[PDB]
Ligand binder design. Structure first.
Ligand code: GTP
Ligand code: GTP
Ligand code: GDP
Ligand code: GDP
Ligand code: MG
Ligand code: MG
Lengths: 435, 37, 118, 429, 44, 430, 426
């Protein structure tokens, strides 16, 4: 069982989904034509399925409103892997509008996507939850991923719904009307999301520049690093491990309060081939790189805030004693501050199977790997800067006629910022020590 | 068989009386004058 | 129709075990006993007799489509603990301000399990 | 000298009966043609109870096949054991039943009564001493529920002292195999309760879970379900055919099973039913058989015996076995579970132990339980029949051929009186 | 190498790389089926 | 034994029956000259020259589409007696097909049925193909069931009709024909399995990647339905179902006899490799409102009678688990007065694929036949179109002049209004 | 004769008990296919306590396998001894527990508690005289902590006169393997207090300290940590299975180790465990084994007995040794340091022996000790619990399953009363 359904929405979700689904094929031996060159292994059923004739079809749905991002997949090297009905395109994009992604153009495909998810869920003997890949900045990456989850809450209720969201980076950004979309897609997701793993492009850019010996990284390098995280998350239930971690346990051990569900994901053994020859990668040495601010994959200093919960996922030939001795040294370290109401802080998970490289990629052959998913108070200043972006555009009512003029009341902006301005004191209240 | 499950009509009526109409008929496809080229 | 129970064998045909992970309609557990003849409640051609009381609902159904569904959809996870009283009031008000959604066949079955602070 | 006449009504009783005669011919050694090729001599003395000798050393089954069309009897004879029945025993009409109890009992079944009863008498008058009758049908269709129930009425008005045994397939609780099935069930029960001495409640849902949880069959068919039915029907008649240290035919079984003439609805079960790959995980002993008989999920009726009390239980054990182990195990189950056994009948279990087991097995037993929880079957159909009679649902296919609404009315009263009698002898002290 | 089964007598194979968990416990159309295990951890 | 006479009327019936009898000859081995290079004796009559002649009549009031049959591949198959041609078409008129030109041709049709009723030992029922929109499809079809009912009576009488499309339409006078043919055949038909044109256009666009279908693809898809309905009279099955079974399980009331047809394994040759076609995954596609072949979502209505007909490598338990899954879904709602809802039909024979077609060779298949409340809005829209036309008297001189009183238009409209009141009075509870 | 039904829930319980069924099959000679391939007849005479006879000399265990997700069961069934368990004894759910006591005990555990107790009722009346039960799990989990306590209550309400055991894995003192460990531990202990006859408290840290400092083990996995737990389980059940000079079953230990019906949380240990290259430096005598019995670093609970006082002590031995030497050593350890033993009991130590040691060892013993110093284990959880409870740290994942706040206050009060009654005798 242990089936999982992945939804990729927006251009970002498809491009990450291309690197996610190539890695899942290399972890199982499934060829691009969907044939395994081999009842043997059944570890594929959490991602793949069967048709009797030896064909494995992903348990994924690809939705976009712009056709020329999925049409590569229909005419690429994986054109025979994905089911055609699982790849869904519209006619016109959301044009960097949450209103188009939610009210006018996102309401178009939502009944067809819900229909396709039902046919995918009907094939699942045991469903762990839903994974949704998007970007806060995109039109359909913010609008359609917001409408989908309201419909998933109506249809599937308390089924676990986890997100991999591309945060707008605090200094580097692509779109101009992007802060408007980020506030709107955060407001309507707070009560519907269960947990939201967050990462932005600027912090991966520095990691790709420094930790890896690649100058000028591409989006393809970013999507593989994200794909290694989602693989490391799920492979506890894909592979034999000492401490099994499931998708349902992430919401319990990382979301203390209902309106704060934004932990930060990082992957610390990211080192180049030339640089892996010199240093050893021990369990204590790679887990300290999970806590360095320069190695965080979200551009915010964790020293500015306090850690609320951490979820350590170890992948490889890790020894649980060396895992235990490593966390003990981090607790004795004073520069990392944990809140008083969480004396435990740490959830550890150990998987036996080493990470397998993509042949020709940037990542080196690590014998062991660790992926950290930590909820920090330091994300509050990211909202404070994101408040400085939306508000500095909203005092003059700039770029609202594209939103208010199409299906959306202006009072939406007059309620969606006040609710997430309450997160500022929600993150303040959890960051005060009780006397 | 495997691709052929033709059920022949073994029973029937002639002269308004109950009967086996065939007495030499196939089963589920298989078995239970001069020959010219 | 009512989804009956086979008593001892209701467990293998429970909804999630039948691979239907969507808030599925419940099954009946007990049935009472009548004590004689029933009464004809409707004449031929199907019309209900004038005397009998009539239900007050849509004859067709309560399917809420993707366009008649209310905007700003409430959540299904509606716990009220570790939440201020005004915020718990807003969460309760949001769920209770759309009674059409909470009575629909494809509706939202909420779970307000929690007590706010005082 | 103690023979019984077999009845096959409807297409459900035809596939059950064809599988039943295949099981008996395998057990008695009869080949697909009709001759004898058995190894032991204990398969010859009581062939008479089921078969008839024909000149040529060939044994002919004493069964009559009735249907409103020859559609399913084309497949019966095209099967492996369709050459053993006489062509004169096949009785078919012209047009189909339509899942109508009307057409099986009033319009189309009425022309076939004189033909079938003529066959029934000519088997029964060739009998030296007839023991009873044995019918397979279903309560959901038109021919099995309509014609077969009428055949019970015409047989019993001619042979009252003889016993009437039937193995009726009741409608499924969850998924209906017929839209109009609550009518045909209620109309059949109203005359089954008056004109039968033994009836067996076989439900398809219970056979499905038996095939998956216990048999662990990956891809079951109706051939397996009819085989489990056929093993039960062969178990109850074993003392007629094989010698034993404690024998009981159908009447000796029927006398101490039913405490009142209206309380004769049972629940079948098979004891040694195990899987293929877990034969080496379970010992084959007397405590293992009596547990599987008295485990709830091994019933064939899809009604939980823990929701009621067992009036009387039967245990027709087959195999060489020690009687202390049988007697001490029946005492424990009655003692360990005292809330599921009535307290105005001191013992509630009848034990009969034969000597010849089913082939391929060491030990076997057949369970017949007269639980007071089979009212759940009658409660469920009564609600459905209420729901379809209140707003006249399919009545015009029924009242448009001759039946009056009073027939449907008196079917409700008598069947709801049956639930009242079950409830009365469940709360009594 | 013939050592008695003691806590200090556990040694793993480091040449093994594939760690694949097969699902011999699952659900068919309503029932908890327990399959016969054909392979172990890693496809061997 | 178990014979079945099929009737086709109108050009719709002929062109559907051409692809129907192409399939019937192909799944019984009948080569298109009548010769075979006993399952055939429900559709075919074996002659004392070895030439198996179809047990059917091709009645049409127009000779043009008939001469395709008299010239094409199945020339020697069809009996020149058993094929009846007209002289002049009804010209989209109920009046002309019922009173003027239909009356001079119906007297020969019933003689043909009578010679066809003498060669059947046991007749299961009739089988009538027509379309609502045409003249001889609506006028002459009415003359059948009025005269077949007095001739036979209790004999089963099933019928297939092309329902008018909800958004496109081939003709303008179509609502006149459809309302007038339902008023007189409401009490003269046992059951009316219904199928649309625009819905199959959507089915042939989404499910199979053959954009731009023609009428041949529609008749092939309809032909798979009629074969699947009558598959159990010819091949062995786990639990057999008759032709007479269909009237008493799908028709709750003598006014409500319009169920909906649905074929689930509607898949091309390129997509059978992508997904498995198990019984649970195809029965869930029957109730899917995008796979249905009448454009009306049953989610907006209620289910009061459903029928499932499986053929192929199916398991009765997988059938049982599929229906119980549908019974747990909140998308599907039933009425209070039908707690059963379903019947099953299982055949051992897998469907026989036609070469040159579009559907792939599937191991198993299911055909779904259900009476729903959602067809009430379809009757509501069709009466709107009739009411917009009959308000200011339009195209009526083309009816009243041709031997037909104008007051028929009234009592047809009075009847049909009650038929909608028959559909909301059946959905309400107590 | 004197059978034990083994039940186990959770990932931690299943991995411990799978290793436990490997030590039992090794010393009873049961082969991975489940056949007797041993040497002596004192290896077969008392098989009934754990295994059951099958057709053709096959021995199927009496284990009941419970989890809400069989991913751990799939790992166990693919091991070297995973085929001895009967497939009918595998009962499993469809969704995960989520490290939630509320899901394991109230909502998600309810759909499986009917199927588990049917299997327990299957294996209870199939034996002549059931001696009792045994449960292995971890208190920091969601289904071991949640469902395991639920299965304890359902067994106790039907079989209240038979001893039941709890090999619970208590939370570690310095590093947590789960964020919501104090909530699951507080809610499970509150169940364990009034529902168990014996309870053995095990943590990973002391097992890590035993593996590093006493085994000299460079790479300790979970196979050899569960071996330390499995050796203790075979030690207490030894007199149930093999003959000895002074036999003592489970309840005979429990009678003179539980002085009041509340104090039943013990501390396990394994004396003969030696270092890597230190076997040639080791004398094979009872005094050196005795000084490793009561030695603090040999404890399996990481609660130092120097900080508390021994209420009662159990000492089950294995091998052919004289009993004057054993009794003298138990008298010397009571008399040399009497400040670590309660002055109100003249003899805190029970001596039990057996004549059959495990294979490869000439002489073996297990340590089971009820000390006052286990109260600091409960205080440490309590101070961690009340830190999360005053700010309402993770309650919205618990009260979202219907659970009320007064149970959390109730669970704190029962532990605080258990601390106070331990503190009374010190
Ligand atoms: N890390 C990462 N981020 C990406 C990638 N591609 C796009 N993004 C982010 O996505 C944001 C834009 O959203 P998209 O998903 O690309 O566009 P969209 O969702 O289709 O929105 P519309 O086209 O307006 O409907 C950019 O600001 C990027 O930061 C990628 O490959 N890797
Ligand atoms: N599916 C399908 N429908 C057809 C076909 N041929 C005709 N029709 C239907 O019938 C309509 C054509 O008019 P008809 O109703 O057949 O005309 P008619 O029944 O012969 O009556 P008149 O020609 O007016 O005398 C088309 O719009 C179709 O809806 C066909 O081959 N396939
Ligand atoms: N056990 C078993 N039951 C069957 C078989 N065929 C049909 N049935 C049952 O019979 C019921 C329907 O009865 P039907 O076939 O209409 O009876 P008929 O009208 O007398 O031929 C269904 O509920 C099926 O469960 C079979 O081969 N074996
Ligand atoms: N001694 C030992 N402890 C274990 C083992 N596996 C897990 N644990 C402990 O169990 C705790 C995790 O609980 P877990 O079993 O995952 O909870 P569950 O998923 O609800 O069953 C951790 O603190 C581990 O230290 C094992 O094999 N041996
Ligand atoms: Mg885009
Ligand atoms: Mg024409």
């Amino acid at each position: 069982m242990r089936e999982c359904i992945s939804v990729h929405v927006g251009q970002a979700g498809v491009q990450i989904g291309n690197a996610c689904w190539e890695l899942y094929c290399l972890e199982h031996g499934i060829q691009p034509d969907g044939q395994m060159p081999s009842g043997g292994d059944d570890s594929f059923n959490t991602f793949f399925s069967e048709t009797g004739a030896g064909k494995h079809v992903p348990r994924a749905v690809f939705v976009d409103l712009e056709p020329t991002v999925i049409d590569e997949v229909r005419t690429g090297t994986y054109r025979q892997l994905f089911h055609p009905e699982q790849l869904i395109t519209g006619k016109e994009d959301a044009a960097n509008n949450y209103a188009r992604g939610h009210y006018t153009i996102g309401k178009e495909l939502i009944d067809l996507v819900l229909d396709r998810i039902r046919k995918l869920a009907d094939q699942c003997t045991g469903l762990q939850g839903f994974l949704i890949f998007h970007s806060f900045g995109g039109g359909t990456g913010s609008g359609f991923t917001s409408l989908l989850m309201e419909r998933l809450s109506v249809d599937y209720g308390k089924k676990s719904k986890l997100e991999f969201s591309i945060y707008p980076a605090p200094q580097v950004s692509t779109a101009v009307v992007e802060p408007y979309n980020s506030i709107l897609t955060t407001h309507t997701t707070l009560e519907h999301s269960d947990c939201a793993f967050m990462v932005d492009n600027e912090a991966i850019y520095d990691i790709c520049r420094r930790n890896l010996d690649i100058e000028r990284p591409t989006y393809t390098n970013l999507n593989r690093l994200i794909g290694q995280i989602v693989s490391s998350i799920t492979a506890s239930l894909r592979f034999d491990g000492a401490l099994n971690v499931d998708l349902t346990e992430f919401q319990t051990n990382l979301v203390p309060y209902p309106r704060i569900h934004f932990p930060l994901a990082t992957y610390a053994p990211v080192i180049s081939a030339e640089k892996a020859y010199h240093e050893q990668l021990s369990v204590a040495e790679i887990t300290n790189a999970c806590f360095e601010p320069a190695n965080q994959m979200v551009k915010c200093d964790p020293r500015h805030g306090k850690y609320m919960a951490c979820c350590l996922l170890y992948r490889g030939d890790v020894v649980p004693k060396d895992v235990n001795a490593a966390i003990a040294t981090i607790k004795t370290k004073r520069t990392i501050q944990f809140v008083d109401w969480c004396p435990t802080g740490f959830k550890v998970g150990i998987n036996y199977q080493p990470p397998t490289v993509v042949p020709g990629g940037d990542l080196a052959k690590v014998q062991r790997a660790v992926c950290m998913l930590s909820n920090t108070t330091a994300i509050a200043e990211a909202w404070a800067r994101l408040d400085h972006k939306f508000d500095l555009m909203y005092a003059k009512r700039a770029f609202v006629h594209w939103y208010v003029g199409e299906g959306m009341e202006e009072g939406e902006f007059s309620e969606a910022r006040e609710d997430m301005a309450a997160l500022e004191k929600d993150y303040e209240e959890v960051g005060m020590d009780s006397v | 068989g495997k691709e052929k499950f033709h059920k022949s009509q073994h029973w029937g009526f002639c002269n308004n009386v109950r009967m086996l109409v065939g007495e030499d008929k196939p089963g589920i496809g298989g078995e239970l004058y001069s020959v010219f080229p | 129709a009512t989804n009956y129970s086979a008593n001892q064998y209701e467990k293998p045909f429970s909804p999630k075990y039948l691979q239907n992970w969507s808030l599925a309609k419940p099954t009946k557990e007990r049935i009472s006993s009548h004590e004689g003849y029933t009464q004809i409640i409707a004449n031929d051609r199907g019309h209900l007799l004038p005397s009998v009381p009539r239900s007050k609902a849509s004859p067709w159904g309560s399917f809420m489509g993707t366009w008649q569904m209310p905007l700003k959809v409430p959540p299904a996870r509606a716990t009220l603990t570790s939440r201020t009283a005004a915020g718990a009031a807003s969460l309760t008000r949001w769920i209770q301000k759309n009674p059409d959604l909470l009575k629909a066949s494809n509706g939202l079955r909420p779970e307000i399990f929690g007590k706010p602070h005082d | 000298m103690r023979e019984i006449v077999h009845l096959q009504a409807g297409q459900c009783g035809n596939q059950i009966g064809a599988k039943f005669w295949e099981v008996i011919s395998d057990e008695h050694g009869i080949d697909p043609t009709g001759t004898y090729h058995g190894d032991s001599d204990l398969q010859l003395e009581r062939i008479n109870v089921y078969y008839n000798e024909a000149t040529g050393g060939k044994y002919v089954p004493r069964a009559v096949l009735v249907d409103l069309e020859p559609g399913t009897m084309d497949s019966v004879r095209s099967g492996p054991f369709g050459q053993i029945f006489r062509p004169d025993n096949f009785v078919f009409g012209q047009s189909g039943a339509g899942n109508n109890w009307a057409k099986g009992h009033y319009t189309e079944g009425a022309e076939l009564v004189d033909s079938v009863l003529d066959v029934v008498r000519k088997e029964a008058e060739s009998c030296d001493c007839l023991q009873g009758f044995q019918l397979t049908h279903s309560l959901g269709g038109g021919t099995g529920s309509g014609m077969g129930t009428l055949l019970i009425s015409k047989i019993r008005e001619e042979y009252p002292d003889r016993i009437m045994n039937t193995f009726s397939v009741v409608p499924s609780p969850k998924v209906s195999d017929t839209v109009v099935e609550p009518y045909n069930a209620t109309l059949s029960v109203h005359q089954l309760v008056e004109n039968t001495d033994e009836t067996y409640c076989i439900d398809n849902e219970a056979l499905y879970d038996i095939c998956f949880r216990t048999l662990k069959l990956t891809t079951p068919t109706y051939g397996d379900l009819n085989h489990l039915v056929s093993a039960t029907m062969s178990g109850v008649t074993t003392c007629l055919r094989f010698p034993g240290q404690l024998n009981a035919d159908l009447r000796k079984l029927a006398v101490n099973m039913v405490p009142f003439p209206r309380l004769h609805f049972f629940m079948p079960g098979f004891a040694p039913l195990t899987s293929r790959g877990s034969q080496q995980y379970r010992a084959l002993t007397v405590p293992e058989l009596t547990q599987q008989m008295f485990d709830a999920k091994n019933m064939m009726a899809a009604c939980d015996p823990r929701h009621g009390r067992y009036l009387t239980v039967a245990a027709v054990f087959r195999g060489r076995m020690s009687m202390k182990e049988v007697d001490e195990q029946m005492l424990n189950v009655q003692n360990k579970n005292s809330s599921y056994f009535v307290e105005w009948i001191p013992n509630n279990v009848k034990t009969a132990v034969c000597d010849i087991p089913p082939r391929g097995l060491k030990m076997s037993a057949t369970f017949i339980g007269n639980s007071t929880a089979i009212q759940e079957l009658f409660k469920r159909i009564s609600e459905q029949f209420t729901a379809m009679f209140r707003r006249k649902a399919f009545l015009h296919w029924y009242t448009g051929e001759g039946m009056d609404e009073m027939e449907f009315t008196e079917a409700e009263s008598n069947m709801n009186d049956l639930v009242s009698e079950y409830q009365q002898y469940q709360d009594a002290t | 190498h013939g050592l008695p089964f003691l806590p200090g007598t556990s040694f793993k194979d480091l040449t093994k790389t594939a760690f694949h968990r097969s699902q011999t416990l699952g659900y068919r159309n309503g029932y908890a089926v327990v399959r016969r295990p054909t392979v172990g951890i890693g496809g061997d």
